[PDB]
Ligand binder design. Structure first.
Ligand SMILES: [Mg+2]
Ligand SMILES: [Mg+2]
Ligand SMILES: [Mg+2]
Ligand SMILES: [Mg+2]
Ligand SMILES: [Mg+2]
Ligand SMILES: [Mg+2]
Ligand SMILES: [Mg+2]
Ligand SMILES: [Mg+2]
Ligand SMILES: [Mg+2]
Ligand SMILES: [Mg+2]
Ligand SMILES: [Mg+2]
Ligand SMILES: [Mg+2]
Ligand SMILES: [Mg+2]
Ligand SMILES: [Mg+2]
Ligand SMILES: [Mg+2]
Ligand SMILES: [Mg+2]
Ligand SMILES: [Mg+2]
Ligand SMILES: [Mg+2]
Ligand SMILES: [Mg+2]
Ligand SMILES: [Mg+2]
Lengths: 94, 56, 79, 136
RNA sequence: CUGGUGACUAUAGCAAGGAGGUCACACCUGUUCCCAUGCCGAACACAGAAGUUAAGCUCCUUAGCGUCGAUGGUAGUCGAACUUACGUUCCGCUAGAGUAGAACGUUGCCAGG
RNA sequence: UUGGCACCUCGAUGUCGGCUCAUCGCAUCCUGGGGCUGUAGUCGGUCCCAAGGGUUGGGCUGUUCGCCCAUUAAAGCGGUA
RNA sequence: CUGGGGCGGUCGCCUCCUAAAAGGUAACGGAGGCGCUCAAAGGUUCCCUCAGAAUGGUUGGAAAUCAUUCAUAGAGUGUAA
RNA sequence: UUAUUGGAGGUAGAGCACUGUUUGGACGAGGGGCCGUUACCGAAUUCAGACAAACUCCGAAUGCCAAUUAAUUUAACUUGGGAGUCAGAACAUGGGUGAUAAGGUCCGUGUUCGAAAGGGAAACAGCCCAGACCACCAGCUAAGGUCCCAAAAUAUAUGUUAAGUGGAAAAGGAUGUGGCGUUGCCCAGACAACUAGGAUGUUGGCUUAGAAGCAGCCAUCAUUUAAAGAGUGCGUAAUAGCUCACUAGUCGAGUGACACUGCGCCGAAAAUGUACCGGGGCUAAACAUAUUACCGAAGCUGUGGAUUGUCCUUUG
């Protein structure tokens, strides 16, 4: 029920394309107790975590040094490619 | 200071691009100018960057 | 055998803005040609019988919001 | 044969066909669906052929949804005329399909039956297709 | 604080619930007078102060509706390179929808308390 | 083929049918070689290879076509202004 | 004028789309109007607010007129847009 | 011309709030066939999902108009003398029309031709590079190229292709071949093969003339199992008969399924002669990705020269 992500800088269209080709999903963490943060996750690890915890399950997301309990608020999907294209993580309050 | 050189012809290019090439002071293919760096100059260059080569 | 009953249109009326926001205009200059009040007359601007907006004084044109959905044009004297 | 009961304009500019599917790109009514992967006009006749093929294979066991509808009239000139002299008369009705659109959906049968039914359907259509399930 | 009168894209509104009445605002009592109703003193107008906070009105609570609304991503696209492919690539710009969230107003002048 | 377009030719690119002379393609009419057959045999059906050669006289009509008579292994389909 | 010409259609003016978010922009492209009307349907002052629905009510019905509530424009604006 | 700032406007996209188009539901004000309750509910409401040149709650990129505006630049306007032009073409792209036909036709935008030679595209106005004042047996480059025709790499590195693909085409068809993932089984012996079994209620029930595992509908259960389907195919008129699934044994190491992709294959028939690389030829001399050279134009440079301007300036 855990997975680590990596912070992003400012990315061009080619940068985003290369991320998705490598197999990572861009995403944004926002919500209680945090500022908005732009992150990359790994698609296979994310799929495994979602299988484990359910669609509405809580995930322990490693964001830099900090760890945040998040829920998948929404995600963008490419059905021709069968590829998750983007993720929104909603940091839930405790 | 920027050295700007017209590396490709203006033939076959839109008139607006030819106008920017003229405004930069470039005349014939391979001609050059030395200009002071600033946003206006950078905008002209950016408009015709496929036609010119810039050296600092 | 074959013919079209279409093939008609009226002359275009050259509507729209005739002077720019921030431009100096003399009194009487038409600012905006229109059907109805797509734009409303503001300060020192009049609306002719055919909805044309024109300046009443010399000054600077300014296109401005009028409430939430509408807009107007005004002319202000230069200092 | 699907077609609008009426339209405001019978003679319409032909639709744009470049770009990707604007919407209706997910299975939302049934369990399985047939997803277009190339672009084509899809006619009322092709829709009817495909629907009959898949329903006959399913043998009334399951439910079928047609997700596309031929809203657009297209015209054709009478045979052996020169160009000009107005636009022609309505010939048929078509839906524009772009990659990602779900053409049909099915429910109430096993996945294997759904696959065979939608295969038989796909051979009636002028686009390449792929079998898709509800996403999650 | 109350009222009058302004400014502001409803972040201001709607809905629901609750509180108030030397003074003020109302409802309210009347139709002699000015004035009025295509009939009606309902309204407008006028005269007035027995009654009432019931309603209006004002204030308080909230997020159900309406309103506002990112970031991230996506569509589209100026320019460039490649291409003829219902196209590809690079750069800049960058929606709509939706998400988080904001919000049950903020203020100028004047007269009273 | 019926057309669409109007690009060469209007200081002329003769137009249907026939005759004479052919020539080429093969999507093969006959003949040669094969697979399948709901191929018993004799016949056939269908498909594949194959263009070497062969592929008729008459009645009617300007006719091309077409119908008809009588044959033939067969009486191929097309391009070449 | 004309996707040869003829035949058919068209010829001036207004509105919309095509028209590529200024303006302009073609085709025998896609749709419609005009050759008026009004003595108030003009001016000005004052006042007023719709269509529809629900529920009651006689002749009265799904719709006539009356009443309350809801109803933000779905009405109306002489005549096309 | 660019930068900055302001503004007009409704396109692309998007959306369904309006006008229309439209798919599945839910619910039902009310009456009818119905006694209350198993049509229509045509109303209204509601959920979810779509479509639009002449729809819009929204709404770009651009383009456009401006600014006591900055940088670069060199035009601009007025008046008068003289004209020509009013058949346009292709290409790219935004659109109409036509058939998302035309070397078609009509508009928008850009380039080139026209009126443009030179290099490339075999040849080839309109494509790509590039605008010839004159001379040179000098140099650097562009597009495009470097095995020979034919100037320059039989260059370097790592892979792909076997189709002369490269050097013409689709739906669709296929154990061609490469890559990256997910995943079932397996030395408690997997896959394949081979040996043996593969049975009983039972010819399940109905139907049928017959229907016995195996025409068609309904079921698809039980017993011994080291396992065996109310049966996977062949077969019979129906039986019969052969066979498979499944299991045990021999053997000993891998063996299947799915997803996204690179490059190939088939589908592929026309007329004078190979004839869909310009030729030879090529298995790289093809393709992909990097790298370093070189060739290559009337482009640019070098040297001399002509004419006309501008500026320093008598001179030049
Ligand atoms: Mg108009
Ligand atoms: Mg008037
Ligand atoms: Mg937004
Ligand atoms: Mg001659
Ligand atoms: Mg043959
Ligand atoms: Mg005789
Ligand atoms: Mg013609
Ligand atoms: Mg425009
Ligand atoms: Mg315009
Ligand atoms: Mg009026
Ligand atoms: Mg659109
Ligand atoms: Mg043409
Ligand atoms: Mg022409
Ligand atoms: Mg053009
Ligand atoms: Mg030339
Ligand atoms: Mg040559
Ligand atoms: Mg060199
Ligand atoms: Mg050589
Ligand atoms: Mg040279
Ligand atoms: Mg030169």
């Amino acid at each position: 029920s855990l997975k680590s992500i990596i912070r992003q800088g400012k990315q061009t269209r080619s940068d985003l394309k290369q991320l998705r080709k490598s197999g990572k999903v861009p995403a944004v963490v926002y919500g209680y107790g945090t500022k908005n943060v732009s992150v990359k996750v790994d698609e296979v690890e994310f799929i495994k975590v979602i299988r484990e915890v359910g669609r509405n399950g809580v995930i322990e997301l490693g964001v830099g040094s900090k760890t945040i309990k998040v829920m998948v608020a929404d995600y963008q999907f490419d059905p021709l490619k069968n590829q998750i294209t983007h993720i929104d993580f909603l940091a839930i309050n405790m | 200071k920027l050295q700007i050189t017209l590396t490709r012809s203006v033939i076959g290019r839109p008139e607006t691009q030819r106008k920017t090439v003229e405004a930069l002071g470039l005349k014939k293919t391979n001609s050059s100018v030395v200009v002071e760096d600033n946003p206006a100059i950078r905008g002209q260059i950016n408009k015709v960057k496929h036609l010119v080569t810039v050296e600092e | 055998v074959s013919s079209t009953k279409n093939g008609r249109d009226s002359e275009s009326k050259r509507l729209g803005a005739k002077r720019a926001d921030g431009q100096f205009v003399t009194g009487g200059s038409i600012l905006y040609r229109q059907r109805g009040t797509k734009i409303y007359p503001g300060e020192n601007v009049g609306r002719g019988g055919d909805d044309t907006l024109f300046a009443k004084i010399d000054g600077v044109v300014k296109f401005e919001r009028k409430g939430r959905d509408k807009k107007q044009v005004s002319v202000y004297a230069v200092a | 044969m699907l077609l609008p009961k009426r339209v405001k304009y019978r003679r319409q500019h032909r639709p744009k066909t470049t770009g990707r599917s604007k919407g209706g790109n997910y299975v939302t009514f049934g369990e399985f669906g047939l997803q277009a992967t190339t672009t084509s006009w899809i006619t009322s006749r092709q829709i009817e052929s495909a629907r009959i093929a898949m329903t006959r294979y399913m043998k009334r066991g399951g439910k079928v949804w047609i997700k596309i509808f031929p809203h657009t009239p297209y015209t054709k000139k009478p045979l052996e005329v020169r160009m000009g002299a107005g636009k022609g008369a309505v010939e048929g009705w078509i839906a524009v399909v772009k990659p990602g659109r779900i053409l049909f959906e099915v429910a109430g049968v096993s996945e294997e039956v759904a696959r065979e039914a939608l295969r038989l359907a796909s051979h009636k259509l002028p686009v390449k297709t792929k079998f898709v399930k509800r996403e999650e």
